[PDB]
């Protein structure tokens, strides 16, 4: 979202997701513990 609010900033994509889970009241540790699993669901979802 930084590019929207000001100067575009570099950020690993996994880092973005961590914030987003934190945005919905989910501890970011969950993501990293399931990064691979989450990706496949996302990858499968876009195909469906």
């Amino acid at each position: 979202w930084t590019f929207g609010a000001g100067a575009a900033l570099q950020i690993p994509f996994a880092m973005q997701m961590a914030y987003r889970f934190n945005g919905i009241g989910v501890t970011q540790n969950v993501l990293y513990e399931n990064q691979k699993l989450i990706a496949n669901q996302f990858n499968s979802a876009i195909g469906k």
Binding site: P12, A14, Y32, E33, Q35, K36
Partner: peptide, 22 residues
Amino acid sequence: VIGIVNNTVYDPLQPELDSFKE
């Protein structure tokens, strides 16, 4: 974790414990 990196997390309680030990 993927991409985790090595480092040491300092403990604020340790110095007090060490001084208390002394």
